[model samples]
Target chain A: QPFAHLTINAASIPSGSHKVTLSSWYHDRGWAKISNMTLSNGKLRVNQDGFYYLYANICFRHHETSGSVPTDYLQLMVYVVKTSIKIPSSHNLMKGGSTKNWSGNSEFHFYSINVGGFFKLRAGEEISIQVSNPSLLDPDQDATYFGAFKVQDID
Target chain B: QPFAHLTINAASIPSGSHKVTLSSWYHDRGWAKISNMTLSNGKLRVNQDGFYYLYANICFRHHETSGSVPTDYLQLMVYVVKTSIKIPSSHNLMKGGSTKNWSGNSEFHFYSINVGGFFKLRAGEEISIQVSNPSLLDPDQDATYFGAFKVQDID
Candidate 1:
């Protein structure tokens, strides 16, 4: 059978460990794009309920602000959830995920860090791709992407 | 005192970009395949001929053929390795992976990618799984699957 999956990506990003607006998002809405997932408000919505492989990628760069030497630490993360919260919960489908710890000088234009994992996602889950600081996100045409698909109906 | 494990994943991949071969791909290998030593090369020839877990994963992506803009840069990687003495061996079952590099133009096709890690043994070998550009793998069949098993000098 064909691989049932959904993927989404963004052009650029803002700052903070917040949900991606998915605002300026790209997904296969129909046969034209070919994905069963789409972005709403700020999450990647899935179409089915099963054991789906959930993944997210966040490309963060260094833009030395304040000329103070980018220090501290920057982290990039990805996960799945349902904000509308049904039974009162926030982590469904592979809801918890990857994190990148950047503990170096932030003087370059940017750098990339990512995380991935498998999850049994439910129908209608939201994917949250966020970072530790907005300064870590680079403003490139394509430096961040998300991917997901149905491995099988483990249930 | 020893370690045993196995991991794998079956995701298609793209070519070049220096990716690894994700083979015998399966999730957790059912826990039955666990040991503290392993082998590679000419059979499972262990570095110390003892026991170890094993793993391997391949991460490839799809952007649709009939063309190639190369505008957007995408990558996926996964692996499973072990060492050998006479020739080498393994005991690190792994190959489930993740990524976070998605900065591109929408309106294209779909694709996937992945990683893995583990095990301990004689600790000095090379478990070759060979590498094929994601463009050279079988997108339909789980041919590039990772294999992991446990071995503990039964005799």
Candidate 2:
């Protein structure tokens, strides 16, 4: 391999396949990555096939209302996909979330997550990030991210 | 060169070195992993000096609220250490945490983290998780986890 088939995305994490906003991808900033990897809609297409380590991190809250109606609970999730397959498959890679009943003027309620693992990928497989509450995420670049790196070839 | 130094803990997260209860280490439960490494006193010690990819996944919540004064905020942390060093070095590998002023009957405030990277290590370095709310993690083996494997050795 000339260079490691590695990449990292820092800001503007994806939401879903159809919901992903490709114009907001952050792989070009903060860290250097691939030029393009079958990117479209809101999924990152893998150009090389191998076992890759994948991850997504998010910092969220239910406290946007400083002096208004406050809320409770937050959920952030990411999925590993093999959509190019004959039978599409999706696995819950990171179900790091919460669901319950309770509320207050939680002006500082913060929830963070980092879920990742080694996933088998073919040349055209795609991956995306999807949060439970899209509006509740902190827009700060340091708070949210999604990335992956090639481990080794499956010789 | 022929195998991956892999291990995964499926339950029982910890807080710090002194306060860590080594009696609760769980490398067995739902997933499968290699045999014991140099583990003692709540630290997963490295057995070989090489570059390895490490990770820790902790699923915790603001549960177990006592009847008296209900609280609102929580913090969780994990660290990598080389205690055997002459001067010793440590890196806060996963600052995947939130220290905020929160309020609720939080029956559903859960936080999870999976932090890892390819780090240089000697045979004596150690890794562990430290949570602000040590008493707030989900004890379920399916919810909390920690794992790592050898990607390649630096020559």
Candidate 3:
């Protein structure tokens, strides 16, 4: 059905190392819609097989103390991964990233990344967002969000 | 109707100073779909009054010569503006931006900004994307794209 849609906002991220999959989100209110979909762990599961529009944004920002600069160059990344019964392993559907040198002693630096596209999804398939650095993610819900909507049904 | 959707890719940006509205797009191919909407001068006008999931991405990148770095810091901005008969003046519906310091002798730097959300719109309402630095916009159509689709019809 055309009414299959889900919108979620980022929540408190669990601290970890390497690439971390964000599994917590606010899907109850504030522009968040949970109609005709399932949010299990952090993956959005489709109820019907169809083509869906998937999109997300992640804001990376932090305040640094004097002489506490992390590094000369910082890299931020966001990934959209799909796990399906048809495929044995999860694959990236969309990838977005940024490389910068904010080593000029700036007390604060802010950058936001967005990635999305249209994908043919199947029932029971799930999608999730993963990031390179979980510590740098902005805590604000509006700055980091994930969503999807069915565009067309497949026979 | 759920069939109302439009997707457009970035065309060559026009040269100008201050903020410039991107009025060119490739709406005919390469994952671009124009099913039941109006694309007039880069503005995606809706055919039916409904809530649409609006989304866009703009990649900003530039190569600088040795000893010719523009500044210590650069700001990139992208705006989604809406114009309609109900409003007298055009206003911003969404905004995304980034700030970075690539002045460490790096010849090339790249950043991508994405912005989108849901909005209740009416027929004859048009939406377009504007930017701060038009020259830094990546020429590739895949890196910069805009699209909208009806999510729900309002009474």
Candidate 4:
């Protein structure tokens, strides 16, 4: 059997001055916990996972200035690992590419990587993903996550 | 007879909503007396005979949040009716050429106009050219004026 899709769940705690903790459950086990969470006016990143469940929780204290404090925002991003990817020598198009030459209407196309062997999920297989928060006060307001499921696999 | 070159003078009036009157003088004794005056911040203009004399005075005031106001800066400028010349049709190469292309470093030349032909003394001829400030409130203070002189052959 093989894993097909990735999922992410996030929640925001109210604005306060208390510490918060974040944890995650995966592979039919109990929640793997982490401590020492301090909630501010913005977003916070829970962790970086390689093709695994990603979750986040925020907590803060309500202060006199909380009313005037702006909302916090958070963002999570998952990137594919390119460790074994190799470009053909004949494709010289990437040599002189620069932002100045990029077309505004062009979309990003991912390059394929050659793993060269059977894909297996070990205890700690390398997964590529990054989570971040762009705002300082409202981390849970606009949290996002990404995952994909395979429709078909070609040999 | 050719008209005389115009002269402009400026003086600073007392602070707190002060006004300066600009007057013009011309060579011919007939109808060349200064007729009208136009004033703006930092510049003033007086119109006389078909020519003009421009004058300007600028005063900059420096104010402190808790202290008395002080005079810290002053600037003055004066411009007379220099020369009015015609732009020859042949010199308009930018628009006259087949390709509409002109040299970036092209030079422009002018020929003076006759002043005594059909010239008549008119109002709004003088211009302000001097800017001065007693206090150094802002360094961006300056005065400007525009006056016209007719072309003529004196010999």
Query: Which candidate wins on TM-score?
Result: 3
lDDT of 2 by residue, A25-122 (tens): 45454543444365554467778876666676666655535343234443454333335645456534444655422254434566666676655567
Q: What is the lDDT of residue B137 in candidate 1?
A: 42
* Candidate 2 error regions (>4 Å): A1-36, A59-70, A76-86, A95-112, A115-118, A138-144, B1-48, B62-104, B124-143, B149-155
lDDT per residue for candidate 3 within B1-155, as digits (tens), equals 53323333444565443588787776666666775778888787878887787777888876775234456666677778888857747776666677766666667988877787766678888888888768777766678777887776753
- By DockQ rank, best first, the candidates go 2, 3, 1, 4
lDDT of 3 by residue, A1-155 (tens): 43322333444566533688888776665445565778888888778889887888777775675234366676788899988655667889999887756666566777777777888988888888888667777665456777787778875
**Candidates 2 and 4, the one with greater TM-score:** 2
Better structure of 1 and 2 per DockQ: 2
**lDDT scores in order:** 0.42, 0.51, 0.71, 0.22
Per residue, candidate 1 scores C-alpha lDDT tens digits across B43-104 of 33343534433443332333445345343444444444444554533444444444443343
Local accuracy of candidate 4 as per-residue lDDT tens digits, A1-155:
12322222334323332222222212211232222211112212212222222122222222333233232211111122211113211110000000011112233311110011011122222223222221222222223222221111212
| Per-candidate RMSD, Å | 16.1, 6.7, 5.6, 31.5
The regions of model 3 sitting more than 4 angstroms off are A2-11, A65-71, A84-89, A140-142, B1-47, B57-70, B81-95, B102-130, B133-155
State how far residue B83 of model 3 sits from its true place (Å): 8.7
C-alpha root-mean-square deviation, candidate 2: 6.7
- Residue A30 error, candidate 1, Å: 14
* Of candidates 4 and 1, the better by DockQ: 1
Given the true complex, what DockQ would model 1 score?
Answer: 0.04
